PDB file of C-alpha atoms and ligand atoms in Angstrom:
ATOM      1  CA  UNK Y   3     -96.202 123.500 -76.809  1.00 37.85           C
ATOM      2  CA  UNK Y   4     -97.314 119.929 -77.447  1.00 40.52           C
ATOM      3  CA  UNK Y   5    -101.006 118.889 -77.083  1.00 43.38           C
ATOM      4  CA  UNK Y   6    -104.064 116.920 -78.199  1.00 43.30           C
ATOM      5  CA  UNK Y   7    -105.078 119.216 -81.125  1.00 44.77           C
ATOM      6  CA  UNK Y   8    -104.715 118.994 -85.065  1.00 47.50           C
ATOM      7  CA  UNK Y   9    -101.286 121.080 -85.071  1.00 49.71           C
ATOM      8  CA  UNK Y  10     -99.336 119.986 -82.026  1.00 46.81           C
ATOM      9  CA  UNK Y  11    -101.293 116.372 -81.361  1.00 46.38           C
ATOM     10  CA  UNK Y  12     -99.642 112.620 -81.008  1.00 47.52           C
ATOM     11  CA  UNK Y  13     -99.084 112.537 -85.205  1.00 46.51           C
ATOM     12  CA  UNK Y  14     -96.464 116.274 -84.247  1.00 49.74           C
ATOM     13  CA  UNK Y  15     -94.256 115.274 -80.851  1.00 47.95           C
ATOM     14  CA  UNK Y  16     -91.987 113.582 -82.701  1.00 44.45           C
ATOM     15  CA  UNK Y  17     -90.678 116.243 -83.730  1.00 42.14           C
ATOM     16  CA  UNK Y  18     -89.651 117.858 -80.171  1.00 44.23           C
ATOM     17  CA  UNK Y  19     -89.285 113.796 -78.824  1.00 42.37           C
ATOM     18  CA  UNK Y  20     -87.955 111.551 -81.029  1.00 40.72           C
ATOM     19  CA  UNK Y  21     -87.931 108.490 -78.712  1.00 44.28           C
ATOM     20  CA  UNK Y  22     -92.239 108.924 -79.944  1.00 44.18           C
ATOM     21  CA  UNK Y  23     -90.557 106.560 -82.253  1.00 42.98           C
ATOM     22  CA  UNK Y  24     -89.017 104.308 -80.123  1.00 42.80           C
ATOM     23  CA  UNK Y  25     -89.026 100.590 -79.288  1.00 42.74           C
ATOM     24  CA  UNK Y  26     -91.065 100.580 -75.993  1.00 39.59           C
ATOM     25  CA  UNK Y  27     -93.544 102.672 -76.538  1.00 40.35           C
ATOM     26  CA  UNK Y  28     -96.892 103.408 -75.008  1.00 41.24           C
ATOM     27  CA  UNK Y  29     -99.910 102.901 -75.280  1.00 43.59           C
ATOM     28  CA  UNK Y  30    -100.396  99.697 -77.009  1.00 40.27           C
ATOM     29  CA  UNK Y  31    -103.564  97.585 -78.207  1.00 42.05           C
ATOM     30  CA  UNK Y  32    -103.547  94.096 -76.061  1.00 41.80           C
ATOM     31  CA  UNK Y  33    -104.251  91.327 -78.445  1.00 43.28           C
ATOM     32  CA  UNK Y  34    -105.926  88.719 -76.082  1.00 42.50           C
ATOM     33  CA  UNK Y  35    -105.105  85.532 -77.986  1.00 40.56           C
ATOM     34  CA  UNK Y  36    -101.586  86.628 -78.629  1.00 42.11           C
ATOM     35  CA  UNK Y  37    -100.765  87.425 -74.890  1.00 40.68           C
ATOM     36  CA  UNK Y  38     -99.047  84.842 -73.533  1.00 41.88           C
ATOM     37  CA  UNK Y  39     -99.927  83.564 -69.557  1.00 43.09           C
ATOM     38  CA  UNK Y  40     -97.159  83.385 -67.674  1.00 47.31           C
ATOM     39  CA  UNK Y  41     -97.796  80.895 -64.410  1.00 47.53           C
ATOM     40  CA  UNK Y  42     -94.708  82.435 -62.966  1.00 43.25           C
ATOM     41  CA  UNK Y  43     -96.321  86.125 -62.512  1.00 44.78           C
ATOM     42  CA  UNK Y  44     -96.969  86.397 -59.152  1.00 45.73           C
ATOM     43  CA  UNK Y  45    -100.019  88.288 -57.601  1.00 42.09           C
ATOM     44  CA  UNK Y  46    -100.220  92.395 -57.933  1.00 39.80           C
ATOM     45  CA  UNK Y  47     -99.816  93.532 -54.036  1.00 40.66           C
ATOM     46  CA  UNK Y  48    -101.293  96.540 -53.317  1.00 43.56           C
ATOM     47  CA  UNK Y  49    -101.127  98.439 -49.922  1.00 43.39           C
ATOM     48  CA  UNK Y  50    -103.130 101.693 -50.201  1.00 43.85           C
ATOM     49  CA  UNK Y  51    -104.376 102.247 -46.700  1.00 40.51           C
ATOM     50  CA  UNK Y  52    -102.022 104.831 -45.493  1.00 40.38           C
ATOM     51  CA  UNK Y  53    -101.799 106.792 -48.545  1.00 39.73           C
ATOM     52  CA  UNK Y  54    -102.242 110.648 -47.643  1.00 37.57           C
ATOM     53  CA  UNK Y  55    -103.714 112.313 -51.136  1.00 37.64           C
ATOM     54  CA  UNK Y  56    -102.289 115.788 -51.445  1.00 37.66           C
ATOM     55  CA  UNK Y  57    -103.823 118.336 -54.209  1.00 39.31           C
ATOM     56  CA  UNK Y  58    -105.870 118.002 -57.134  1.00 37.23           C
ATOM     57  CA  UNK Y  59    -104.273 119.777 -60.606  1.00 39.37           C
ATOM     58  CA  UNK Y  60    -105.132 120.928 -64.207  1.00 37.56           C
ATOM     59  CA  UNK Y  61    -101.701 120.993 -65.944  1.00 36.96           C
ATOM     60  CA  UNK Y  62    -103.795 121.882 -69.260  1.00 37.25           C
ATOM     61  CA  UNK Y  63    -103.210 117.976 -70.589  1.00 36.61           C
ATOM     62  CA  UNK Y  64    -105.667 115.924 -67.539  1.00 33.19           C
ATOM     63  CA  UNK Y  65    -105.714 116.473 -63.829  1.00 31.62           C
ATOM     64  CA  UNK Y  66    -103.587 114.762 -61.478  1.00 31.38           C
ATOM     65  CA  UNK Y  67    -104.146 113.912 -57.761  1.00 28.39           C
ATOM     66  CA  UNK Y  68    -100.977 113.735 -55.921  1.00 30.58           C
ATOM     67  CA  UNK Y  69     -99.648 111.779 -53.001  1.00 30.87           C
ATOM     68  CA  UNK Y  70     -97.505 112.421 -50.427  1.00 31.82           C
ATOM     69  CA  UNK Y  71     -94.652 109.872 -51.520  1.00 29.25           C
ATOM     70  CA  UNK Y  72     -91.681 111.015 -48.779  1.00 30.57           C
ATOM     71  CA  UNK Y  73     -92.467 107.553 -47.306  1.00 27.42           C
ATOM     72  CA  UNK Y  74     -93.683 103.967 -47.949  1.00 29.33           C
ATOM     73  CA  UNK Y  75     -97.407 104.490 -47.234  1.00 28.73           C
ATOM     74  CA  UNK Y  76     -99.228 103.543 -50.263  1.00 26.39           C
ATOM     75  CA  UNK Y  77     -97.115 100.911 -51.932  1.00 28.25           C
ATOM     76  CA  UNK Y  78     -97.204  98.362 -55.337  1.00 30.34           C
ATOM     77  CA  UNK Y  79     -95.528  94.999 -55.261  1.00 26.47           C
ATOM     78  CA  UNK Y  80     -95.408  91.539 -56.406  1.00 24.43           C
ATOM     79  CA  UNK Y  81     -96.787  90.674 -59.770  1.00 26.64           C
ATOM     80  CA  UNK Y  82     -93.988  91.248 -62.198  1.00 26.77           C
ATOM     81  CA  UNK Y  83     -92.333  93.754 -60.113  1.00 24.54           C
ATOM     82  CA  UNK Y  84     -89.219  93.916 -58.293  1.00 23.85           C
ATOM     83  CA  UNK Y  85     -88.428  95.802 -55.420  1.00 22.28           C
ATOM     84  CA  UNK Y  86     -90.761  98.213 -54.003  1.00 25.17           C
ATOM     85  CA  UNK Y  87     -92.928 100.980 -55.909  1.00 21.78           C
ATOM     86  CA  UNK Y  88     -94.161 104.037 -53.898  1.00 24.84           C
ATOM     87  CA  UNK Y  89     -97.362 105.933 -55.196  1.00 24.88           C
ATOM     88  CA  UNK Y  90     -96.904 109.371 -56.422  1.00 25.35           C
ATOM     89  CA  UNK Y  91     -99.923 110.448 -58.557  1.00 22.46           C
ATOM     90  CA  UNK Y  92    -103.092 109.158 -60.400  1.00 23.51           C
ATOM     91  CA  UNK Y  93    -104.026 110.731 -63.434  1.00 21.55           C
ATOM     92  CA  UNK Y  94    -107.130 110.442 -66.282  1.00 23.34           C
ATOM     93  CA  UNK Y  95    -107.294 110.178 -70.090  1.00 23.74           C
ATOM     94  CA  UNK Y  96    -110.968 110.817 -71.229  1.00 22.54           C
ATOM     95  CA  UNK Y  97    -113.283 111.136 -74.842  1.00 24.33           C
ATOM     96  CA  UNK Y  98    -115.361 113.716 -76.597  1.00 25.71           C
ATOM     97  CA  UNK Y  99    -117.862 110.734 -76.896  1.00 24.51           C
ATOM     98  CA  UNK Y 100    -117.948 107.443 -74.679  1.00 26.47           C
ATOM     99  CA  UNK Y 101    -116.771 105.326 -77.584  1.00 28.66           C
ATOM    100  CA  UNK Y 102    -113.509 106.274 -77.079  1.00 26.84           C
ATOM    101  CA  UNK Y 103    -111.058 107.779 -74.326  1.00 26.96           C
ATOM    102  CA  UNK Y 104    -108.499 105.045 -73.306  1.00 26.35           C
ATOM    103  CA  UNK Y 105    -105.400 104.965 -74.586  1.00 25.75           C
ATOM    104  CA  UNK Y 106    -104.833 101.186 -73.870  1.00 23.95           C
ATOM    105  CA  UNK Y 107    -107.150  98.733 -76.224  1.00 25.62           C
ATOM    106  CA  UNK Y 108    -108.092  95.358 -75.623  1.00 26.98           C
ATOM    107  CA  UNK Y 109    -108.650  93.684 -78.834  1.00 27.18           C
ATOM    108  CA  UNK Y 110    -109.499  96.682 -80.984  1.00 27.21           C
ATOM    109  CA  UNK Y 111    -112.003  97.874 -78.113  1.00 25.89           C
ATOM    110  CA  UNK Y 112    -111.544 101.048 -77.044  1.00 20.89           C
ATOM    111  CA  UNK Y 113    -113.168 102.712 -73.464  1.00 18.51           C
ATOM    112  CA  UNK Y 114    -114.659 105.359 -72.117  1.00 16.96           C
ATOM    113  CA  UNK Y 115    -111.528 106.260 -70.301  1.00 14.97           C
ATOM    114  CA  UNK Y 116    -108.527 105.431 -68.341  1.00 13.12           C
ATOM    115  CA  UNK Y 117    -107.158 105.573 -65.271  1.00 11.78           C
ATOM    116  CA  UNK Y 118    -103.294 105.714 -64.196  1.00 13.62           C
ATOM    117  CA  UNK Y 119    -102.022 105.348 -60.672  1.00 12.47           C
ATOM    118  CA  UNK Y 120     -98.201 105.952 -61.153  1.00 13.83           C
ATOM    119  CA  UNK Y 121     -95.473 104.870 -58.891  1.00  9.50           C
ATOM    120  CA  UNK Y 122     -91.604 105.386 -58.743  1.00 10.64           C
ATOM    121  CA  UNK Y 123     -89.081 102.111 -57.766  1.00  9.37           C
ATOM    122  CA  UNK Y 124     -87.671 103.028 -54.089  1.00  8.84           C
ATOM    123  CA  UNK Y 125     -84.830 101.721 -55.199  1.00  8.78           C
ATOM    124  CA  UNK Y 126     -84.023 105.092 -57.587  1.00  6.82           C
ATOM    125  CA  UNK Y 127     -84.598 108.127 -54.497  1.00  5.09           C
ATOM    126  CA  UNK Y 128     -86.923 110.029 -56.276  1.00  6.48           C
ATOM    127  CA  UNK Y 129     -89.224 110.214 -59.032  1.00  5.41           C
ATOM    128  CA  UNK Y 130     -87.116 112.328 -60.921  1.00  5.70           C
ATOM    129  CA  UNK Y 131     -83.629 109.242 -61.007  1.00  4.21           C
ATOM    130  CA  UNK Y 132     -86.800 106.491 -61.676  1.00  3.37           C
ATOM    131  CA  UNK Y 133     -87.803 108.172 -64.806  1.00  6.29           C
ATOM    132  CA  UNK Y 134     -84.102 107.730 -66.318  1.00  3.08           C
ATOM    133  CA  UNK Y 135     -84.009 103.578 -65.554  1.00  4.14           C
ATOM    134  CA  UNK Y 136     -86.005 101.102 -68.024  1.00  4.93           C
ATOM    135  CA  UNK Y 137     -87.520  99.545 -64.602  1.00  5.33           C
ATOM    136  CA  UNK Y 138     -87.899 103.321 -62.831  1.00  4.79           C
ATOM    137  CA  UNK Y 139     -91.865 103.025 -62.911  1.00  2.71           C
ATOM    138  CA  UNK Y 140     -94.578 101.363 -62.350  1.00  3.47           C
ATOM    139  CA  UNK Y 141     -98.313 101.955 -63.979  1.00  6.56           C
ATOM    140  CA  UNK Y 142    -101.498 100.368 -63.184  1.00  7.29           C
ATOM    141  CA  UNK Y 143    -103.972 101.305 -65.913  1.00  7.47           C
ATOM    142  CA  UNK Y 144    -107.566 100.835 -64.705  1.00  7.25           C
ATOM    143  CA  UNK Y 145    -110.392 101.240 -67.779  1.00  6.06           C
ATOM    144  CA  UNK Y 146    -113.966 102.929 -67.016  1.00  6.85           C
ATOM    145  CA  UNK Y 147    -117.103 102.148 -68.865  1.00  6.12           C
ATOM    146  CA  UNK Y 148    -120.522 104.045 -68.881  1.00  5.27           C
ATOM    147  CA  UNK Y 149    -123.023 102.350 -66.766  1.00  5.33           C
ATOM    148  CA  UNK Y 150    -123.749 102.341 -63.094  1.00  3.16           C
ATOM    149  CA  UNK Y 151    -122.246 105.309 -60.708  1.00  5.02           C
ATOM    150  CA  UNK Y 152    -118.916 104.703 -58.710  1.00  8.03           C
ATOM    151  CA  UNK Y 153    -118.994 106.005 -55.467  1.00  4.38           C
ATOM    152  CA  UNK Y 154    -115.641 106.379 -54.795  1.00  5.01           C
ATOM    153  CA  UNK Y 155    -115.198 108.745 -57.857  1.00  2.99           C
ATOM    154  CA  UNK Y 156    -117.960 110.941 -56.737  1.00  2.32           C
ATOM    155  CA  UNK Y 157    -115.465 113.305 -54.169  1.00  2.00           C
ATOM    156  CA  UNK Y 158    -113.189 113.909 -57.462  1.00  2.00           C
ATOM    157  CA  UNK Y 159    -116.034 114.668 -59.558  1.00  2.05           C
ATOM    158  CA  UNK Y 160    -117.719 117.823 -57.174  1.00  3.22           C
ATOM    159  CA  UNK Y 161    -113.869 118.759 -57.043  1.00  2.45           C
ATOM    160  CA  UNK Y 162    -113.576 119.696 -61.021  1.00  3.33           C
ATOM    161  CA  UNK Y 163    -115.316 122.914 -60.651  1.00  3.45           C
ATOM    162  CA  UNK Y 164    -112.909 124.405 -58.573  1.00  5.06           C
ATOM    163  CA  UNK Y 165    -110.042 123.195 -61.073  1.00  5.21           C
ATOM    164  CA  UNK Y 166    -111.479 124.181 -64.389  1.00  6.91           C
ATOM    165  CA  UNK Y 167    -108.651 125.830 -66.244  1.00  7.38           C
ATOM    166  CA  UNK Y 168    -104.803 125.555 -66.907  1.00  7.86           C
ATOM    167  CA  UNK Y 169    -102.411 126.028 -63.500  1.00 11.70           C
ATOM    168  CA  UNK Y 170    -105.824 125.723 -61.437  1.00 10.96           C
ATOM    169  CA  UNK Y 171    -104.851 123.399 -58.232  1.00 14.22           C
ATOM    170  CA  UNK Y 172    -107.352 122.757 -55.334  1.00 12.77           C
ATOM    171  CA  UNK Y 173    -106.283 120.466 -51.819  1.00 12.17           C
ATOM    172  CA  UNK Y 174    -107.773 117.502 -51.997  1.00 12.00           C
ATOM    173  CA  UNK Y 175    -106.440 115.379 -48.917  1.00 12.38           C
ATOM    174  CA  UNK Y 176    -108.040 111.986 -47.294  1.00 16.25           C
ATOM    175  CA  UNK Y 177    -108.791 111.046 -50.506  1.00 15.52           C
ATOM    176  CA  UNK Y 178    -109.318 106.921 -50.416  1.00 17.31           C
ATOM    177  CA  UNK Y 179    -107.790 105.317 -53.521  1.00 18.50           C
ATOM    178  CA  UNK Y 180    -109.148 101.823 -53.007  1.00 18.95           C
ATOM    179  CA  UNK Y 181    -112.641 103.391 -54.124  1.00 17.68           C
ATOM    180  CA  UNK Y 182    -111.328 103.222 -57.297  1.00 18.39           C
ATOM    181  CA  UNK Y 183    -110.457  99.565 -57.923  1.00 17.48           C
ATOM    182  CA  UNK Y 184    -111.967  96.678 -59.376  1.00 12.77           C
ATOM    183  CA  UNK Y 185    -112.838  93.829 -57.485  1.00 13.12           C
ATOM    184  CA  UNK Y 186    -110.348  91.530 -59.772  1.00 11.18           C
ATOM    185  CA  UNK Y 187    -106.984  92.294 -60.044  1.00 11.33           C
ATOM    186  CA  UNK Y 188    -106.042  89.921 -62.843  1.00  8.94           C
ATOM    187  CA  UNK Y 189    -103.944  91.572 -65.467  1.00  7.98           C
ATOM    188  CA  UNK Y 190    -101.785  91.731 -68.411  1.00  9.73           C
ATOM    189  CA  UNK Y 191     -98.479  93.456 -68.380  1.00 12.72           C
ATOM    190  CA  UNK Y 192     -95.568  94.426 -70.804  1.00 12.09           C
ATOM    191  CA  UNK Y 193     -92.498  97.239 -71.105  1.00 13.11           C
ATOM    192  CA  UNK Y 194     -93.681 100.281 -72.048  1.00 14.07           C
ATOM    193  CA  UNK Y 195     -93.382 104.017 -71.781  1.00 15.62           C
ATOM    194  CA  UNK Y 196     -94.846 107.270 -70.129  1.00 15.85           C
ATOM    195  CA  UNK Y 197     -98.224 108.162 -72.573  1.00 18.90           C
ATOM    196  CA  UNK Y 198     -96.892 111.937 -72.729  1.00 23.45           C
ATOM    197  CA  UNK Y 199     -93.961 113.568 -73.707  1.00 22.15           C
ATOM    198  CA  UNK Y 200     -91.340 112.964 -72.730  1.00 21.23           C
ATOM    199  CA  UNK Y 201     -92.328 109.942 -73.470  1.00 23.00           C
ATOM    200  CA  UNK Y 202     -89.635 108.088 -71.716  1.00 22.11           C
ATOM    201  CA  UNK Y 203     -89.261 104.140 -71.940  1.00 24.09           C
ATOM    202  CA  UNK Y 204     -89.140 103.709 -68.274  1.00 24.08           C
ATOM    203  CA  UNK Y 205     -92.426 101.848 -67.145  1.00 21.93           C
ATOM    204  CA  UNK Y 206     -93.327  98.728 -66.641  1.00 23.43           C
ATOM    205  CA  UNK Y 207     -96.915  98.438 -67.458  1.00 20.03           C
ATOM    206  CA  UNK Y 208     -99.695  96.696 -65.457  1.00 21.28           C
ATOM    207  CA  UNK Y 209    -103.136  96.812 -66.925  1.00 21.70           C
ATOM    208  CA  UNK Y 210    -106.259  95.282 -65.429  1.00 22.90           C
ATOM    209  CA  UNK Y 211    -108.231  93.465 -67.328  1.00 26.58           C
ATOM    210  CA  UNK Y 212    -111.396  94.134 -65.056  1.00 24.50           C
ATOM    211  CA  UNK Y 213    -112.978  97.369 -66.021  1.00 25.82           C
ATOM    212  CA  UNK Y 214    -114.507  99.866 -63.403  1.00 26.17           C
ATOM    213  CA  UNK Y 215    -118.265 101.528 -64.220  1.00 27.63           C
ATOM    214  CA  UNK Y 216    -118.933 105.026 -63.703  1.00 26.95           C
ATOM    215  CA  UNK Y 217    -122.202 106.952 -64.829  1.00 27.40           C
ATOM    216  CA  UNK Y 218    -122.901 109.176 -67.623  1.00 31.28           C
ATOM    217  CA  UNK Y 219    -123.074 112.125 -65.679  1.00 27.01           C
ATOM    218  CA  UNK Y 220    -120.027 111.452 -63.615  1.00 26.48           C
ATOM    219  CA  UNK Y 221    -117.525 111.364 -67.345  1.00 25.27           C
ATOM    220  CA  UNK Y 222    -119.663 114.425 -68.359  1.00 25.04           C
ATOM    221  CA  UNK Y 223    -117.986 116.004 -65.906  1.00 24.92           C
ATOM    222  CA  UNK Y 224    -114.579 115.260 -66.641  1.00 29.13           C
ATOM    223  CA  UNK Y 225    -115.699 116.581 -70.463  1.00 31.00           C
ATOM    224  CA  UNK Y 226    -116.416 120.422 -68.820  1.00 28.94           C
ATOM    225  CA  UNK Y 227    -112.302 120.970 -68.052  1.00 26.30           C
ATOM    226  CA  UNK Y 228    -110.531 123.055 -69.814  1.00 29.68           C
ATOM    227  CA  UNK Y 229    -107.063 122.931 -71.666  1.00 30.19           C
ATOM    228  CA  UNK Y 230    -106.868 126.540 -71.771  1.00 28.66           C
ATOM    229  CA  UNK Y 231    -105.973 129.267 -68.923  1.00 23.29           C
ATOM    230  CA  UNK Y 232    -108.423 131.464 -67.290  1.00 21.90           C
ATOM    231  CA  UNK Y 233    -108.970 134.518 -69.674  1.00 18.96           C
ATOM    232  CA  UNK Y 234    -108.259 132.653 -72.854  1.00 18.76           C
ATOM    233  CA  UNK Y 235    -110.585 131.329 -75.745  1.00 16.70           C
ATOM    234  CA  UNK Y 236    -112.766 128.506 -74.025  1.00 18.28           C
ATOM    235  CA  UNK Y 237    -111.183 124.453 -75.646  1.00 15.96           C
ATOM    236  CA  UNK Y 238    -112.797 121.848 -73.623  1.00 15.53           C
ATOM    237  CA  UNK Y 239    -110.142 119.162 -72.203  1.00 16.58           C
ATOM    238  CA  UNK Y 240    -111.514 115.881 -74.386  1.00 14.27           C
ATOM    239  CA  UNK Y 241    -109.810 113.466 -76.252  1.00 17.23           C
ATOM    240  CA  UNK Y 242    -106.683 113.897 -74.099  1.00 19.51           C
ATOM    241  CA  UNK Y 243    -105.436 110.205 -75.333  1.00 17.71           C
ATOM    242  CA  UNK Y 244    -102.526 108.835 -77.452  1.00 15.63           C
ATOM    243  CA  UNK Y 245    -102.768 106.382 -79.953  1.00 12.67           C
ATOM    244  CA  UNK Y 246    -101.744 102.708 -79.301  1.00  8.33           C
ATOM    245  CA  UNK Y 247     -97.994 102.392 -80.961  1.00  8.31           C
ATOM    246  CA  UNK Y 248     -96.779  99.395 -82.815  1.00  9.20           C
ATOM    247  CA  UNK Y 249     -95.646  96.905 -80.389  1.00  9.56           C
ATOM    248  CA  UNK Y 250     -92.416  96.018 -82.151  1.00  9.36           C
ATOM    249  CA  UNK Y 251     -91.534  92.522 -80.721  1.00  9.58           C
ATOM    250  CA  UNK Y 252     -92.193  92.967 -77.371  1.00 10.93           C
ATOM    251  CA  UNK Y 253     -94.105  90.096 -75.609  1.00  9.56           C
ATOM    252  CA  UNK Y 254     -97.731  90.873 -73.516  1.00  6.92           C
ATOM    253  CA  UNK Y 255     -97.741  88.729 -70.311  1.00  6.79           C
ATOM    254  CA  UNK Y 256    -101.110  87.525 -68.708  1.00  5.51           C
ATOM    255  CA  UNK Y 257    -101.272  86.479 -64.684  1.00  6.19           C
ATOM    256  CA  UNK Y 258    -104.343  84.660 -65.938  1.00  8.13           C
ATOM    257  CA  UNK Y 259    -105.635  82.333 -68.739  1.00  8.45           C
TER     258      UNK Y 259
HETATM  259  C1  AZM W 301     -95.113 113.411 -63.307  1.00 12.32           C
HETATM  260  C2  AZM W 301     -95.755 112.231 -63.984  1.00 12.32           C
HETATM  261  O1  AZM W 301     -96.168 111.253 -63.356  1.00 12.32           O
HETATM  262  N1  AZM W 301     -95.927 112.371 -65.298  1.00 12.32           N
HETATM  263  C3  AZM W 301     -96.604 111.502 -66.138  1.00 12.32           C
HETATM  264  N2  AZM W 301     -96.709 111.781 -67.496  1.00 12.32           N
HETATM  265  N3  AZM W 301     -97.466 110.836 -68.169  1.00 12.32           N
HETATM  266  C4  AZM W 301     -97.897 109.862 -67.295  1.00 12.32           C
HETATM  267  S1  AZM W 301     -98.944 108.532 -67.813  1.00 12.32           S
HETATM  268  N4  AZM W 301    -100.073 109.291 -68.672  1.00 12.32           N
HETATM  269  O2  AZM W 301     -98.235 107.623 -68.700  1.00 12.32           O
HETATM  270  O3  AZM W 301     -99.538 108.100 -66.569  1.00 12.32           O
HETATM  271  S2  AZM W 301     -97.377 110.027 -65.643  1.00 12.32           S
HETATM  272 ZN1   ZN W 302     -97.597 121.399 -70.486  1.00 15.50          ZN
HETATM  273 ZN1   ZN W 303    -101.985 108.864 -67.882  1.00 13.51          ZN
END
């Protein structure tokens, strides 16, 4: 089964997805001086006040929160986007070390982390039609640097105990995701795929360029998760990132200059 480890990392999926070779894929390193601002981008519009936060999971790769997405409650439009895009999950990539842990890089930098809050074009019916059409998603990556504590991150953290190993799922509802956002919301976007298999060239990427700050001892917890099942030899869940991919002619649109 494919993972983040020397035998079945990034460098093996290939061989069980071959589109790991493809034209749009994801993540990528954002070349600031090469990204072109486009005036026409309009601004990101993001409605998050009636979202209704689900369950917290280990799926043995990261954790996910999920949403309740049978409606439109918590919502992304505007910005390059057509159509509406309905929240479904959020989801983490972290490091061994706080050097590294994104899977997005600005310029060569990379973060402590990264943060993705996916969502699925109405248009499609469900999340499972969206992932088959080059515009079916929607991804707002949000990066996290070491330095002061963020509050809003706090209720997930005291969660991860509860969800240490593999299959491990713990209800997590009234959870507030506009605790989690930066107070800019300029960004860069470009075509793109999903960051694990199967790796599907369905998302349209929107990355802030406004990074959120989170304490030590808030990513140390993310660093005590396991990949493994309960009852199995102890591998901690770090470095659960891919690789930026070659861009391949694709163009990197800024909504600001
Ligand atoms: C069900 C679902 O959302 N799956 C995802 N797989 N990878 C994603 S990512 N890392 O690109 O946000 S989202
Ligand atoms: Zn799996
Ligand atoms: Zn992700």
């Amino acid at each position: 089964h494919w993972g983040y480890g020397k035998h079945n990392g990034p460098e093996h999926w290939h061989k069980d997805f071959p589109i790991a070779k493809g034209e749009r894929q994801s993540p990528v390193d954002i070349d600031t001086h090469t990204a072109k601002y486009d005036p026409s981008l309009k601004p990101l519009s993001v409605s998050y006040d009636q979202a209704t936060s689900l369950r917290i999971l280990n799926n043995g790769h990261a954790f996910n929160v999920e949403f309740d997405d049978s409606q439109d409650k918590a919502v992304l439009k505007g910005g390059p986007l057509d159509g509406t895009y309905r929240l479904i999950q959020f989801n983490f990539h972290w490091g061994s070390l706080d050097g590294q842990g994104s899977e997005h890089t600005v310029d060569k930098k990379k973060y402590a982390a990264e943060l993705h809050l996916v969502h699925w074009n109405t248009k499609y019916g469900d999340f499972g039609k969206a992932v088959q059409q080059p515009d079916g998603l929607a991804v707002l990556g949000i990066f996290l640097k070491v330095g002061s504590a963020k509050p809003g991150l706090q209720k997930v953290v005291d969660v991860l105990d509860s969800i240490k190993t593999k299959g491990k799922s713990a209800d997590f509802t009234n959870f507030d995701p506009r605790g989690l956002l930066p107070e800019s919301l300029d960004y860069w976007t470009y075509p793109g795929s999903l960051t694990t298999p199967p790796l599907l060239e369905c998302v349209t990427w929107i990355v802030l360029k406004e990074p959120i700050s989170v304490s030590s001892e808030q990513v140390l917890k993310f660093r005590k998760l396991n990949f493994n099942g309960e009852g199995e030899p102890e591998e901690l869940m770090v470095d659960n990132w891919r690789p930026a991919q070659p861009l391949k002619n694709r163009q990197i649109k800024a909504s600001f200059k």
